Amino acid sequence: ERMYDVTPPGVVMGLAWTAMGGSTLFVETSLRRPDGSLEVTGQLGEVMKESARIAYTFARAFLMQHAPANDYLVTSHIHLHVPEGATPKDGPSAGCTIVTALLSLAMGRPVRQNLAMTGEVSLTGKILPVGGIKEKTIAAKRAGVTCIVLPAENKKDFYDLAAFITEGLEVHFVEHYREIFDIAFPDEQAEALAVE
Numbered sequence: 001e002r003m004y005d006v007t008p009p010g011v012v013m014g015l016a017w018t019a020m021g022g023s024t025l026f027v028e029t030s031l032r033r034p035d036g037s038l039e040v041t042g043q044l045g046e047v048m049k050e051s052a053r054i055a056y057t058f059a060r061a062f063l064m065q066h067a068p069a070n071d072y073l074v075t076s077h078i079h080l081h082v083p084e085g086a087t088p089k090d091g092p093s094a095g096c097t098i099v100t101a102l103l104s105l106a107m108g109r110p111v112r113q114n115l116a117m118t119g120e121v122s123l124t125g126k127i128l129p130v131g132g133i134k135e136k137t138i139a140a141k142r143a144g145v146t147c148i149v150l151p152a153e154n155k156k157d158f159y160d161l162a163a164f165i166t167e168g169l170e171v172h173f174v175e176h177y178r179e180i181f182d183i184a185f186p187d188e189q190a191e192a193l194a195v196e
């Protein structure tokens with residue numbers, strides 16, 4: 001009951017909440033050409049369009065720090081679209097979902113399947129709380145998500161949910177974005193038998 005059953009690179013699942021309940025929105029990223037830029041579509045609002053420019057600044061900065069060999073974001077002409085097409089959307093609960101879509105694209109490696117997230121991001125990566133966590137959690141469950149990432153400040157809003165709703169959700173309560181990265185992209189933080 002969702003738009004994507006398998007998120008490729010550049011596609012992350014987010015959570016949006018309306019007065020009619022929850023819903024699952026998918027952030028998407030792609031290339032336009034083979035200084036680097038950014039483009040946005042999906043009837044986004046003046047408040048969220050700032051969350052894109054913040055997540056874009058942070059994702060570039062995150063690349064600069066952890067994998068400095070990766071120039072993908074500082075040079076490429078990127079395009080972000082959040083379907084469905086004509087629905088209006090405004091709000092920073094898409095912040096982290098965007099960062100992950102940008103990194104996922106800039107790495108060429110998809111995100112954990114069956115993962116939804118929501119949370120406002122700051123410029124330094126602090127993950128700030130968002131609203132209607134009850135309806136975002138419910139729409140993740142009605143839509144088939146097994147791993148949810150909430151802002152850690154939104155812990156009560158999640159545990160106000162009945163016993164049957166939250167059971168069976170791998171939920172992570174995160175304060176910086178580095179905690180979302182280690183969950184969205186697990187293989188990065190995974191022990192291995194270094195051979196040779």
Ligand SMILES: *[B]([O])([O])[C]([C][C][C]C1=[C][C]=[C][C]=[C]1)[N]C(=O)[C]([C][C][C])[N]C(=O)C1=[C]N=[C][C]=N1
Nearest residue numbers: 014015016017018025088089090091092093094
């Ligand atoms: B968030 O709660 O701010 C959310 C972000 C929606 C955009 C998005 C979500 C997930 C992935 C990618 C993009 N904003 C909302 O849900 C908006 C409307 C979205 C269509 N609703 C509100 O901001 C709001 C305000 N007051 C009461 C109820 N809703």
